[PDB]
Design a protein around this ligand. Sequence first.
Ligand SMILES: NC(=O)C1=CN([C@@H]2O[C@H](COP(=O)(O)OP(=O)(O)OC[C@H]3O[C@@H](n4cnc5c(N)ncnc54)[C@H](O)[C@@H]3O)[C@@H](O)[C@H]2O)C=CC1
Ligand SMILES: Cc1cc2nc3c(=O)[nH]c(=O)nc-3n(C[C@H](O)[C@H](O)[C@H](O)COP(=O)(O)O)c2cc1C
Ligand code: SF4
Ligand code: SF4
Ligand code: SF4
Ligand code: FES
Ligand code: FES
Ligand SMILES: [K+]
Lengths: 44, 430, 230, 213
Amino acid sequence: PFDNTTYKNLQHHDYSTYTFLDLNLDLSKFRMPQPSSGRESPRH
Amino acid sequence: KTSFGSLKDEDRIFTNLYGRHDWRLKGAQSRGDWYKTKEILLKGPDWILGEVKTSGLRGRGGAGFPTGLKWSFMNKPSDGRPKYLVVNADEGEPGTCKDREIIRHDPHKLVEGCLVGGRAMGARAAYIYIRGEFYNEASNLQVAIREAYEAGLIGKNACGSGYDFDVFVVRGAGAYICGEETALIESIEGKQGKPRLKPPFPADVGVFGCPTTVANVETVAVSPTICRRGGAWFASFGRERNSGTKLFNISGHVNNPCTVEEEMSVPLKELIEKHAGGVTGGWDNLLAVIPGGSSTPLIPKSVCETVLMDFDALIQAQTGLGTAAVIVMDRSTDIVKAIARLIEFYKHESCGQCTPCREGVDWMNKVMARFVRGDARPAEIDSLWEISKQIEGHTICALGDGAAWPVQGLIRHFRPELEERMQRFAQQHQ
Amino acid sequence: SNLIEVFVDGQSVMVEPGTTVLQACEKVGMQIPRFCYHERLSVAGNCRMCLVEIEKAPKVVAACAMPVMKGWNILTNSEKTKKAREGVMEFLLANHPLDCPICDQGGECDLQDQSMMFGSDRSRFLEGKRAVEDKNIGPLVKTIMTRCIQCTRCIRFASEIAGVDDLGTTGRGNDMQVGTYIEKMFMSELSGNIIDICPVGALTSKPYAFTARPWETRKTESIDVMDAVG
Amino acid sequence: ALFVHRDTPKNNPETPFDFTPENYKRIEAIVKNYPEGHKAAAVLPVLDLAQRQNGWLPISAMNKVAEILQVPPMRVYEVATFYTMYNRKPVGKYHIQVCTTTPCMLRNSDSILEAIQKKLGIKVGETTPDKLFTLIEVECLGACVNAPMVQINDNYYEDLTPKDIEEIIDELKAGKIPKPGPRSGRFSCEPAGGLTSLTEPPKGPGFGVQAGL
Ligand SMILES: NC(=O)C1=CN([C@@H]2O[C@H](COP(=O)(O)OP(=O)(O)OC[C@H]3O[C@@H](n4cnc5c(N)ncnc54)[C@H](O)[C@@H]3O)[C@@H](O)[C@H]2O)C=CC1
Ligand SMILES: Cc1cc2nc3c(=O)[nH]c(=O)nc-3n(C[C@H](O)[C@H](O)[C@H](O)COP(=O)(O)O)c2cc1C
Ligand code: SF4
Ligand code: SF4
Ligand code: SF4
Ligand code: FES
Ligand code: FES
Ligand SMILES: [K+]
């Protein structure tokens, strides 16, 4: 059924303070290894 | 084709702009998103660049640079450093709220645009720099990115095409200057959001010193539709070198302030009277229009009658298209107070690295405060014109030009009103 | 040879690749004004005093950071180069304090010298100036930050040569200040060189304070014997 | 609004602060988002996480961020002082930010500001005596077609009238969080007089695909 009389973006009413951070923490498993510049820091 | 506008709903790239449909993956996949992406990823980078530059798409950030050449600047063999595609989702320009709608309602279109753009220039990953104030939009984008990762559309072997691509979201911390591409690059790296000097261009030295291409949300989200429908379909709308569609935010003293997609060469009067329901008090109550947000000079009522909202015709009206943010002020508006508030915004949002903006923008703020009060003389009006000319073109970034331009437009189009203000202050206070 | 050819005021000069506009102009004896560029520090390019005009190009470039490509003609004494210099000098002197008689940099101030040489002769500023709270970084360096022009030689020296990383920039816009943000003493073995490289009287020598003026001092070139470096 | 720090009993380097272990795992994820050799790029999100945990930034979170990222503390001081979202003073539980830029000023945002002022009995930049509300004035927030609007913490309240913002404040004093949306008839950004565009159902997959793809 085609419905355009309702707002479907109602999920953000239940977001907490840490939601972005736990989303990133759960996403951390799928991500690929990062490239390295060869040193720990530019000050090293 | 001479007349432009009245775009059909079948030609709109940004469906579900108003959020009336499902923004998640299941609803987006039924609207054409993530369709045949393996074919575009397997057709090569040069084919994608050719499809982009045949459509004639120009940058939607506000500079209006051609997108095909800018993206093909990174079509070079790598020298051991990775390459990065960075999406500018700051949107700190007043009057502009289109990217918030694109992120909040069509996140999967942005993710597919990131993947297609990264394949077009061999990017290792994607860094989306959203505004720090857009917490809910950032969380929606993270949810959609998680849904894309779990479905195998991005990550290792993205879309089954053998290409490896990651999408990251970085939240800002409330700085308008971080919308500048080099300042955005510096802010991603953990430094203060101060812009760099060019050269080196971001295609040579960008984020972490790697090759980097900074692209707007609007010019990235349309790229899968460009590669899918074709470049000639996008070029069929608009004039020469003004091809395609554009999202307009009509706001201010208007009946229905709204965000709407339209053809690029639409008349301003037709756009206002059709989509926004007209200005308050009818068209004869119009006093001034700022067509491209706070970074563009304003135009009076006599110019908005016969003007077109593309790059070239607005350039010929000694203003700019900008971010296509139409701010409307009627006859019940103090124009001097509005421009003074704009200059106060530019003084508050200025990184202060380079001398002319750091000193001169505060100087213009004080001068326009005295102009609002009327405590000046016309010699100071010409002095302010000279100061604005001194700021423009002598700065590191384009915030100085964006602070000089509105004052120049206000002076040029409303010098008699300012002069009447100061002469009535002089004759009242003495 | 890998040298390319550029032109300074129409005079040909062979320069190495990677040479800046400033060094190319220095090769023929022309010294473009600077406030932030130092030859022993990294290039910051924020004072905008070195804005020179390249011919057949509708924009002035920063000579301290712009590399020269071949066929370029540099106009060091054109009209718009002088206009850019006058505008930048006016912006630098807009918020500067009227402290020249009470400041130790008088008579050897770079700001005074290339305001007299390259700037205008009068002020259009009809507003009030700013005032910056002074800081304490040790018994060696007297700090008066109302006179600072935010040239950021402090941070570049303390990070790239002294290697201390204690100085920085806090704030945004006109309220941006140079300091350590806490009551910290910048005490190193190379602290007085920040007095040396400050182009204005913002950092001065506390033992030398209020004692002499630079025009009346006789200079004798000698060798330090305090250590074995010589 | 001072960009220098003076030692107080409330704010000193000896003020206790440390991250929770779950926040340590979140910090690990943030660090893993960045390439090796560029660990300093995570100064911004870790500092934001410290502010989210604490509510404000004393000079103990800045030193903790400098310690766990191996960066000088001066760089963390620069980062904290440059950006306006970081609070270096203890704000109240609800931080109300009212946008007064010109597209919001044209739609009578100062009426909302004075409505909040007489409802709370304070002025701009001040805090209520019971430490529940803080009222400041900000620049544009990217909701210009939904002007006038305010932002309370993460939430946006748009298309507000004085009655609507008074209702929001009264409901916030009761402990219930309102719906972060426009209070007018429209939902997000559509015209109030119906949908002038996107009124048709979307065509779906495979519509308008060029040949050879
Ligand atoms: N969208 C927004 O929120 C805002 C937009 N603007 C608009 O943005 C513009 C200023 O932005 P900018 O990117 O600083 O200006 P624009 O002149 O430089 O450059 C646009 C892009 O083209 C690239 N580019 C241009 N020439 C190049 C060359 N020869 N080689 C390599 N790359 C080259 C630049 O690297 C940049 O990414 C103005 O038009 C202003 O109105 C201003 C304020 C806010
Ligand atoms: C002060 C300033 C602020 C800017 N803010 C933004 C912004 O918020 N979003 C954006 O897309 N571009 C912004 N830009 C323009 C960028 O520099 C750059 O042109 C854009 O991010 C990418 O251009 P494109 O549309 O060709 O991809 C800003 C520029 C300046 C000078
Ligand atoms: S023009 Fe202003 S905002 Fe841009 S680099 Fe200079 S000081 Fe910073
Ligand atoms: S630093 Fe130079 S310009 Fe400033 S008060 Fe001292 S002598 Fe005068
Ligand atoms: S105190 Fe002197 S050297 Fe340091 S930033 Fe200011 S002008 Fe430059
Ligand atoms: S000397 Fe080049 S900008 Fe300062
Ligand atoms: S002007 Fe207020 S949200 Fe943009
Ligand atoms: K000095």
